[PDB]
Design a protein around this ligand. Structure first.
Ligand SMILES: O=C(O)[C@H]1O[C@@H](O[C@H]2[C@H](O)[C@H](O)[C@H](O[C@H]3[C@H](O)[C@H](O)[C@H](O)O[C@@H]3C(=O)O)O[C@@H]2C(=O)O)[C@@H](O)[C@@H](O)[C@@H]1O
Ligand SMILES: [Ca+2]
Length: 241
C-alpha cells in the first residue's frame, strides 16, 4: 500500500512493543522506522527520544509513501509526557513532503521540493510553543521557515496536554504563489498562507507523509540527559484532490 487515506488509533493493540512490521501494517509502508523507539502505551503511539542523542540517532524518522496528489489533509493528536523535559526543542507530529521533500540544511531554493512539518521551541526566557517548520522555494534561511508563527501566540504549551493538529497542504503551479500551508491547533489557526513550494512542475506533487520525531537542532544544547516520550493518537490522513 501506497495509500491515499489512513485511520489509525492503535486501539487494536496490547500495551507493549510496536513493530516496524506493525508500522507497515497500519501504514501500508514505513520507510526508516525504528521499533526500538516505538511502543504502544494505553492505546497511543509512544515514540521515544533517547538521552544524550539528537535527530535520527535518538528519535524516529519514517516517511510513509502515499498516493501522489495536489491537496492533502491530515489530523492527529499529540501529548508530551507529564514529566517531559522540553530542552531547546525538536520536530514533532505528522507532516507532508513535496517533490524532493527538502529537509536537513537543504533549502528548496532549486524549486524541486519542500516539506510542511511542525516543531516545538523554547525561547531563552522559557516560553515553549509549537511552530511551523517549512521548506519551500522562497524560504529565507538554510533551515526551516517558521513564518514567525507560534502556538499559543502567548504563553506556553503544557506537559501532558493533548493537542489536536490539523495539517493541510496544496501543491502550487508553475512559478505562482498559489499553494497552501495550513496548520490548526486545537481549533486555532497557527498558519494559513499562500506559498510557492516548487517551481519545477515535475516535483510539484505531494509524495509522502513525514513522521519525524526527534530533538534538535544540531548544537549540543538541544539534547536531554533522560529518555523522553511523546504520545500520538487518532491519525486521519486523507487525499483531497
Ligand atoms: O538555538 C537555536 O535556536 C539555534 O537553532 C539553529 O537552527 C536550527 C533550526 O532551528 C532547526 O532546529 C534545524 O533542525 C534541523 C537539525 O539541524 C538537523 O538538521 C535535523 O537533521 O534537521 C532539522 C531540520 O530538518 O531542519 O537545524 C538548525 C540548526 O542550526 O541546527 C540555529 O539557528 C542556531 O544558530 C540557533 O541559535
Ligand atoms: Ca487510541
Amino acid at each position: 500500500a501506497i495509500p491515499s487515506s489512513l485511520s489509525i488509533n492503535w486501539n487494536n493493540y496490547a500495551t507493549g512493543a510496536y513493530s516496524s512490521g506493525n508500522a507497515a501494517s497500519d501504514f501500508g509502508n514505513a520507510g526508516g522506522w525504528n521499533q526500538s523507539r516505538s511502543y504502544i502505551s494505553d492505546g497511543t503511539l509512544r515514540v521515544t527520544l533517547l538521552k544524550n542523542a539528537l535527530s535520527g540517532a535518538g528519535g524516529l524518522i519514517s516517511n510513509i509513501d502515499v498516493s501522489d496528489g495536489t491537496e492533502y489533509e491530515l489530523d492527529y493528536d499529540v501529548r508530551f509526557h507529564s514529566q517531559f523535559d522540553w530542552s531547546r526543542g525538536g520536530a514533532v507530529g505528522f507532516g507532508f513532503s513535496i517533490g524532493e521533500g527538502n529537509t536537513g540544511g537543504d533549502p528548496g531554493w532549486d524549486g524541486n521540493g519542500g516539506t510542511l512539518r511542525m516543531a516545538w521551541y523554547q525561547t531563552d526566557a522559557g516560553r515553549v510553543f509549537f511552530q511551523p517548520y517549512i521548506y519551500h522555494k522562497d524560504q529565507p534561511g538554510q533551515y526551516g521557515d517558521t513564518f514567525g508563527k507560534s502556538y499559543p501566540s502567548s504563553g506556553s504549551i503544557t506537559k501532558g496536554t493533548t493537542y489536536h493538529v490539523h495539517v493541510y497542504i496544496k501543491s502550487n503551479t508553475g512559478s505562482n504563489r498559489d499553494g497552501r500551508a495550513q496548520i490548526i491547533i486545537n481549533g486555532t489557526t497557527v498558519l494559513d498562507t499562500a506559498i510557492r513550494w516548487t517551481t519545477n512542475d515535475a516535483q510539484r506533487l505531494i509524495k509522502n507523509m513525514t513522521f519525524h520525531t526527534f530533538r534538535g537542532g544540531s548544537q549540543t544544547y538541544w539534547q536531554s540527559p533522560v529518555d523522553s516520550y511523546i504520545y500520538y493518537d487518532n491519525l486521519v490522513l486523507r487525499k483531497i484532490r
